[PDB]
Design a binder for this molecule. Sequence first.
Ligand SMILES: Cc1cc2nc3c(=O)[nH]c(=O)nc-3n(C[C@H](O)[C@H](O)[C@H](O)COP(=O)(O)OP(=O)(O)OC[C@H]3O[C@@H](n4cnc5c(N)ncnc54)[C@H](O)[C@@H]3O)c2cc1C
Ligand SMILES: Cc1cc2nc3c(=O)[nH]c(=O)nc-3n(C[C@H](O)[C@H](O)[C@H](O)COP(=O)(O)OP(=O)(O)OC[C@H]3O[C@@H](n4cnc5c(N)ncnc54)[C@H](O)[C@@H]3O)c2cc1C
Ligand SMILES: [Cl-]
Ligand SMILES: [Cl-]
Ligand SMILES: [Cl-]
Ligand SMILES: [Cl-]
Lengths: 395, 395
Amino acid sequence: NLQDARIIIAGGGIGGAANALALAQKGANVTLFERASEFGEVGAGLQVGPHGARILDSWGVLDDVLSRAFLPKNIVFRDAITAEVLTKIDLGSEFRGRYGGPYFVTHRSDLHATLVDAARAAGAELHTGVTVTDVITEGDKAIVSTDDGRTHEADIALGMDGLKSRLREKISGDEPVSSGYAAYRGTTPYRDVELDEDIEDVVGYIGPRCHFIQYPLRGGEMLNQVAVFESPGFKNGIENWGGPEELEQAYAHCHENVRRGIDYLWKDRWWPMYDREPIENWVDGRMILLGDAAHPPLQYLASGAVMAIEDAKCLADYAAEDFSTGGNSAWPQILKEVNTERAPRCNRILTTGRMWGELWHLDGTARIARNELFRTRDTSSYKYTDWLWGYSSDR
Amino acid sequence: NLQDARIIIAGGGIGGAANALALAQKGANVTLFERASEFGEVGAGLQVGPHGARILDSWGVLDDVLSRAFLPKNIVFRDAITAEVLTKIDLGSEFRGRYGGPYFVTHRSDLHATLVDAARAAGAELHTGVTVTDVITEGDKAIVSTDDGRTHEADIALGMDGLKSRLREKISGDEPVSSGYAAYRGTTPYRDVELDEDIEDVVGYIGPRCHFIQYPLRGGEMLNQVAVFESPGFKNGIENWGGPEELEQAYAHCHENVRRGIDYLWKDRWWPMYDREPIENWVDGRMILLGDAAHPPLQYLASGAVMAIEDAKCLADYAAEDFSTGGNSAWPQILKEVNTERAPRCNRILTTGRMWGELWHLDGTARIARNELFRTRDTSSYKYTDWLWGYSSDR
Ligand SMILES: Cc1cc2nc3c(=O)[nH]c(=O)nc-3n(C[C@H](O)[C@H](O)[C@H](O)COP(=O)(O)OP(=O)(O)OC[C@H]3O[C@@H](n4cnc5c(N)ncnc54)[C@H](O)[C@@H]3O)c2cc1C
Ligand SMILES: Cc1cc2nc3c(=O)[nH]c(=O)nc-3n(C[C@H](O)[C@H](O)[C@H](O)COP(=O)(O)OP(=O)(O)OC[C@H]3O[C@@H](n4cnc5c(N)ncnc54)[C@H](O)[C@@H]3O)c2cc1C
Ligand SMILES: [Cl-]
Ligand SMILES: [Cl-]
Ligand SMILES: [Cl-]
Ligand SMILES: [Cl-]
């Protein structure tokens, strides 16, 4: 356990919250600073495969998250032009047996609140409206600066300040890499969505230069919808690219079931999709980058928040194992071993995820090939998914 | 049979020769005019699947063609960058049982000579150094004009004057459509080719914007090699595009086994690859277009000469069936019924063949998808090939 340990976490998204929870459950003294004046997340869906669900269960929060989640029976891929089913991933008891938990979907806001509440309950000291302005390592401590003029001492600090991380600048000068794709979301009362057939699955329509995803939330009462498309504005240097004037033309070539979806999306806000090139080293002295600060992906594998959750589990587990015997002096080795375990995993998600989205967005003969590949696969095989959903950091 | 019938054939390529043979075997009076001063073909390979081999057998010439041919055990597709086997089409006894004949390869020159010799033996009157300058229909006869100032009367005329057909202008004003790809050939003494492993198959290396094919000829004594690549010169308006200064860069990204091949090719001559858009109607009065004049493909399905051979069989069979009972008056109906049977078949080859070559030449994620599609297929299935190799015109 981590009783005598002190950890400061810079950032209170899903990542920082999950780390606060995992560390406080080991008995660590955890202080978390969040920039925003309240804890919160977007009131729309995310997907959490068994690689995240098993970890939530270990922390004792999965039952509760599920009480407010939805349990899809399958992930279903459809052609966005014809609406034809291409393939399904069965998320039933064999899936759950194999991977040690369910594949679920829920509101980001609910998952985030659940984590924050559990971290507090476990002893974490969370602070809102506080920005971490610097982290340095001096001797055997991290020294953390905040925007109220204070400095704080801890054993280690976690840089969990997201895609636009400034703490990352201590290690890398890279900038976010634009995908040229933009994401829109919507949640609609389920019954207000014009549906030809009801939805109890995660449905992904994949088409030339676009996709469209639907899934139920909150026990089937709401439908989450997500539209991702290639922005022509981006290729022309528009700074504020991907705006809603692009949506109608971006989908004009798709099936009516996809085109009807667009009307339900929120149009006041969107998410231009960026990632970063993979980096191996996430550690600067007694600071480690985790979550999107270390490994921000494009969302094709629906695993960014899951990776941040995995990060928490690995950090807490490896530290509790080694700090007990080696104390504070052991922290740099612990960070190194966490980085060595996590980088190959997460960097494969970044890179493979780019290829996976490309595979979705093919046109022409390439689309013909992709459709037939999906149709004819051995659905009993897990070779395309075991690397993702079957990973564990357990040593 | 066709005893009282008179047919004039404009063109003496593989198509015209095969039609001369098929018609003369039915007892028709056949006169064939060829522009060139000698009958001949290129001294390099072509492939003849069972859809052509069965027909040659019916005419009694397959045994003889085979005595000078090669019988590959498989068609083998390899990735042009890695040289990895992707899939094989087994050409063994089950294949031959299914499709009614062998898949063989031979010299174009030999097949052509064999057909010409057999057409002569069967009674066809062949003439070299004679160009057909016009064909018109007057009453119940075709009237054919030649470049020695003569005119000739027949019951029907076949326009078999190739990709650059002028007779086609009677029916369509279309021009050849450039693929932007160019083909080079070579034959090398088998033993002079630097081979890591010996070849007893048709091998197709398929890569980004290029392919490379090898197969043995003449009982394994020579190796046929064919290089097809996307010409940058074409996209820049070079009239004489696809020249050999393009070959080295076109293959630079390929595996050594492909790159070594280029040195063996003839560099003095090449074949810029054109086809035509499919047309339904091939008949103008008592003239019918057949062979490349009617349906010139890109060569990805290795079936252009085979289609011309099929044309001959259908024409001869359908005419012999109906002329016997209806005489000369029946010829326009016969041509219509031959056109109705042949156009959907051949036009599917034109169109599908374009998609098939595109499938070969994919890059990026599309190539990744295509490779995996090929690898994982049900090799016991014939669904990708029965339309091609299992067709018959028999009614
Ligand atoms: C359209 C879309 C769909 C997605 N869907 C899925 C999905 O289905 N499943 C999945 O697992 N993932 C998904 N993701 C990925 C997931 O959203 C992210 O990977 C994940 O939320 C990252 O969490 P984080 O805590 O590392 O970073 P963030 O969520 O960015 O949190 C960083 C926090 O740090 C705060 N902050 C910033 N700087 C400072 C500072 N200096 N001091 C203090 N606080 C600071 C910010 O206010 C923010 O609260 C998706 C992403 C997108 C864009
Ligand atoms: C690189 C390449 C590879 C190929 N490989 C294969 C393969 O493996 N298998 C396959 O089956 N097919 C293949 N083909 C296709 C095949 O070559 C052609 O489809 C076929 O040869 C066409 O035969 P044809 O008799 O209709 O026309 P052509 O071969 O063009 O013959 C037309 C003839 O008419 C003559 N002529 C022209 N105008 C006149 C006139 N006015 N009067 C008299 N004579 C005239 C010409 O001199 C010529 O001899 C390939 C083609 C290419 C380019
Ligand atoms: Cl993601
Ligand atoms: Cl992801
Ligand atoms: Cl051809
Ligand atoms: Cl062809």
